[PDB]
Amino acid sequence: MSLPEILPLEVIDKTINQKVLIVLQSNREFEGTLVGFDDFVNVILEDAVEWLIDPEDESRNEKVMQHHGRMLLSGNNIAILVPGGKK
Amino acid sequence: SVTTEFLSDIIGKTVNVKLASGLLYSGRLESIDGFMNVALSSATEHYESNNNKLLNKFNSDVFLRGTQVMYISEQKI
Amino acid sequence: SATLKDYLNKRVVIIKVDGECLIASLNGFDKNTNLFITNVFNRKEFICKAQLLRGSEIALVGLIDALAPIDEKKVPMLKDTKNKIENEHVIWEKVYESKT
Amino acid sequence: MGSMLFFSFFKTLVDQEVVVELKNDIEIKGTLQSVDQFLNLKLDNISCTDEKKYPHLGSVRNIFIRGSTVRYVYLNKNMVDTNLLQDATRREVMTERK
Amino acid sequence: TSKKANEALTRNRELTTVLVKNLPKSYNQNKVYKYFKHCGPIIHVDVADSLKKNFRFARIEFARYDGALAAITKTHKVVGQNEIIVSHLTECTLWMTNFPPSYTQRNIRDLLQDINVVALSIRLPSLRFNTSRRFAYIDVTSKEDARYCVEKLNGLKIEGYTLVTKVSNPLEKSKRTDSATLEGREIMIRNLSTELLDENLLRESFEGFGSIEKINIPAGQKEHSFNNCCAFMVFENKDSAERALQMNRSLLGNREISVSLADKKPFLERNEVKRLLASRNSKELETLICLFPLSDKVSPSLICQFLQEEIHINEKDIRKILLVSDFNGAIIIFRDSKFAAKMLMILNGSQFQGKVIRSGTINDMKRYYNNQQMSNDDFRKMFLGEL
Amino acid sequence: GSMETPLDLLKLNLDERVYIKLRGARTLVGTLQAFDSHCNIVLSDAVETIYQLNNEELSESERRCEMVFIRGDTVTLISTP
Amino acid sequence: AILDLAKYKDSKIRVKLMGGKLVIGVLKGYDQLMNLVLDDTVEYMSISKNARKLGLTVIRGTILVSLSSA
Amino acid sequence: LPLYLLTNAKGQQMQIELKNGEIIQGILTNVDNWMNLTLSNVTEYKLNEIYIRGTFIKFIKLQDN
RNA sequence: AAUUUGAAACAAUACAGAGAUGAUCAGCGGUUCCCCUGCAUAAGGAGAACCGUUUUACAAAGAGAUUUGUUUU
């Protein structure tokens, strides 16, 4: 009967090699392919898009940079991980 | 582990290091530690993007506090 | 050793990181300077008696002698521990062109 | 664990007259009485420097200062052996990461 | 009766220890290990240079006798181009005592070197339970070398100390000069008045209990006009001292005295350290620092000597040095908190016995010891599917 | 071979004049006597510089001091003048 | 420790976060460090017009400042 | 002594001002050694329980009692 | 179960290996736990950590209670 549980770090593991959107505490997010992470959820992303986000209108978002290669994004400011990315 | 292997294979490459303050540093990564402290040679300083007004050009190594580091990424541009 | 022992059950002045002074009596403290205090008031209507101040928010405890002497109100109003200026980058580009 | 360096450094300055400048812009002249592992300072016989513009104290002779609120500690050159500081420093960074 | 199965444990030692002679100059401790580890589990390997530095000796202590035998089957094998010899190490062990308190293993190796004797192994005792322990076992390479070391080194004066060098045999051990205290025959009498600090009066007052071997009155008690004085009294047998303890809480003259069996020094130092480790005061603790991690073989004289020769500290700046082997460290108590703080700064990360050591408070020493001990929808769909 | 950490490389600058940029639009220049892994620093013969914005003109003031301890959490970057 | 999330293990909760963000969603799972798995996630910034949809998400336990029923 | 006072404070009315200047008014039901709370019957400035991350507390006004 | 002082720990330091020890770093009563001898179970072996209990010369004074993810913005 009782259908099994989802464990957060396990979801993040299941997101390795998929697209992910990492949203920080500020109005900023990084979309990219998740390469890996460590104990503290420092994340390695590949070919990341960096967005500043407009609170009222999601269209007036600002692409700050197109990254190439890998970046280490420190898990200090990381609020939300969305597997598969935006919409 | 994925992170320590990343640190190993980005020594010597050109990177961008963005602080929490939004300051952006570009140059050659001379050193990095586990705490994301960074040393960079030939660093330029811009706010948010390399395309914005130049704030500083540095002529020796710049050291940056890992506690203040938001990201480090390879530069390929 | 620097403990807040000597200040127990004595009148104290507290500055919180927000930039607010407090007159109080420090009934208790922990090793995170979490202030247990009573008969607190500003600097100047009594707010209360008995509150917990969290150590993270404490900037400064001062030991005072007598409660009167003193009062004040025409002072530039003290700041916070944060130095979130505003458009720091604007200031840095101004400094760049200033050095050009 | 590590740190130690500046903890020991301050233990050498106990009973020296220093000036502590804070993140709030307040400057405090005083006599160093104690320091702890977080570099919290207990100053005796204090007086606000720059100007008593910050009267908020006046009736305060000895203060405890939360280490995390300090911005600067001004000292005199007479008080420090710069050889010990450079040597200790090279040994310490060596220690914290090895 | 308790019996001498000391000869048992010594036979075990020799029996499972081998001497390898004539290894190549290039052979290090590790290569000795690899060559012999097929012989049996190995407890220890020592390597030493020959006199003219043309080859090496090795000592191998095996776990069990079959391993020593297997090692001995390698005699007359060829290593590199060197023909080695493997034999039981026997009647080649010295016991040495009363070298100067500041002698090191290197000093002892060089001592034997000066008379052209190779030392293969120098074994020093743990200071865990007695900080003052000071003797050594030394394995050399031949029975003759042992006899030469006894002839030349026993009675030699080194830094004012009359050296003792013996062919090792524990059954022949000397009776210690403090044996009376160790045997529980020495009482300490405390809270005497100055009027009462008189050997004659004490003999009349205590001799009823048994023959008195000795009375010692610590100097300086009358000269400094003490309120309370102490005296020590050694009786020839334990029964006499025990019965003399009945004078405790009794009246002597016009004073009330305490009488107890004298404690021994290693005991007293450990209680001082126990007192220190549990302390929550601060004037005393702020005058001391800790050094760690250290071998339990390192004596205070070596640490003091280290401070003088390597750190250039004045002898009178050090009040006391105490060992703390339960945290692999040592405590140095200085003359002021500022000097202690400065030594703390200077010493952290320095090298002692070739290893980097750290300094800190007692709680620091304890802490260090304890620490060493794709598509959003797709993902949603799997989970939803389970539901 | 090996791994110089950024801290180790910075300790190569010990006893030399460094430039430090601090939070709150302030910079110091001085001779670096010490630092730890939190970037606490002792500077000798230091010069602080406070930068402010009056409406649309940049203004500055300066302080100078013999010997100054600096809490690491105010430090944003270190380089040479 | 103090709050057993199991009682909250399948209803919509309201979660305030450190940088000002407010998030509402159905609690699917969690750990001891209070990392959370939320479904039907809505992210609000600082009323209703400031709304973004995020779907399935993980909120990092390190920045959580308050939790309640919704 | 302070967290001790919170432990015994279990069941008291309380007002909690957080770092975000919001207010909480409720009846303490549990604290832990890190100062996190859960509180009964709550007003944000409607809820029945609430969990408050101790790092996000500015201070707690207790009852004069 | 605490500190300081009276208060002097003498007697030449050393004087037999982790082969050392006085709760000096212990004995005993219990709880839990890391592996083996082994299919099992069950002797027993290598034990670790927490909690009861068994030890301390006298005096006086003053009185240590701080208790073993908040401080690198």
Numbering used by the authors:
A (entry chain E): 1 to 87
B (entry chain F): 10 to 86
C (entry chain H): 2 to 44, 47 to 69, 75 to 108
D (entry chain B): -2 to 95
E (entry chain A): 26 to 398, 432 to 445
F (entry chain C): -1 to 79
G (entry chain G): 26 to 71, 82 to 105
H (entry chain D): 2 to 46, 65 to 84
Task: Give the article text.
Thus, U6 recruitment into spliceosomes proceeds though a novel, and poorly understood, RNA remodeling mechanism involving large-scale conformational changes. The core region of the U6 snRNP retains the unique “interlocked rings” topology of Prp24 and U6 snRNA and is virtually identical to previously determined structures of U6/Prp24 binary complexes, with a comparative r.m.s.d of ~1.3 Å. There are protein–protein contacts in the U6 snRNP that were not visible in previous structures, including a 660 Å2 contact between RRM4 of Prp24 and Lsm2, and a contact between the conserved C-terminus (or “SNFFL box”) of Prp24 and Lsm5 and Lsm7.
Instead of being bound in the Sm-like pocket of Lsm3, the terminal nucleotide occupies a new pocket comprised of residues in Lsm2, Lsm3 and Lsm8, and the penultimate nucleotide is bound in the previously identified Sm-like pocket of Lsm3.
